[PDB]
């Protein structure tokens, strides 16, 4: 198993709500946290996968812990509504992921974004070159829908890394008729 601390961010924002694929888009993100958390549970009992949010705050509710079933209870009433922000969850995931254990793992982030997120091109290039300077490989995931011609997350894939990069990838999702296990099975390959 490859050594990283993958940081999952709940997409508890207002564009993860309707009845297009399932009658509940929370099942998509919830089962995504299920498959990555059981993936890190079966992967290594030395990781630390807790929770971080993007809506209006970065609330580390539980301990950044190798346990997950409490966070799985926190997946219930996740409140999928709020001000989505791409800038804060990665930064607090970085300084949160500098508060880690006996350094056995690198820093990975998965960022569930179901919105045309409010981020400048200057903000993604500054954050993405800070992540160049700070040795982080990020798996970038669209849920719900992002607007067509995705600018934020795709150019965040662009300027992310190098010198053992190869983490920066994006699966954009359309708001069509499908099911949510294909909406996580499509980014389960290349996050």
């Amino acid at each position: 198993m490859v050594l990283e601390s993958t940081m999952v961010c709940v997409d508890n924002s207002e564009y993860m709500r309707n009845g297009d694929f399932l009658p509940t888009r929370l099942q998509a993100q919830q089962d995504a946290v299920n498959i990555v958390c059981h993936s890190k549970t079966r992967s290594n009992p030395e990781n630390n996968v807790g929770l971080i949010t993007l809506a209006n705050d970065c609330e580390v509710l539980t301990t950044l812990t190798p346990d997950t079933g409490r966070i799985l209870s926190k997946l219930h009433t996740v409140q999928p509504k709020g001000k989505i922000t791409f800038c804060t969850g990665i930064r607090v995931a970085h300084l949160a992921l500098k508060h880690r254990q006996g350094k056995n793992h690198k820093m990975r982030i998965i960022a569930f974004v179901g919105s045309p997120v409010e981020d400048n091109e200057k903000d993604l290039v500054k954050l993405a070159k800070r992540l160049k300077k700070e040795k982080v490989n990020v798996d970038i995931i669209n849920f719900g829908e992002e607007e067509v011609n995705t600018e934020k997350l795709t150019a965040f894939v662009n300027t992310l890394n190098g010198k053992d990069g190869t983490g920066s990838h994006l699966v954009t999702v359309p708001p069509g008729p499908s099911l949510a296990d294909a909406l996580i099975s499509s980014p389960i390959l290349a996050g």
Binding site: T24, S73, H76, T77
Partner: protein, 31 residues
């Protein structure tokens, strides 16, 4: 058809909260 889902999440919260009623009961009862 969503009242069974909210009452169902409240029922898993009733199993967790009953596990904390047996942790507030049993786990405190240990000490």
């Amino acid at each position: 058809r969503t009242r069974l889902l909210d009452s169902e999440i409240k029922i898993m919260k009733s199993e967790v909260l009953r596990v904390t009623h047996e942790l507030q009961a049993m786990k405190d009862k240990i000490k």
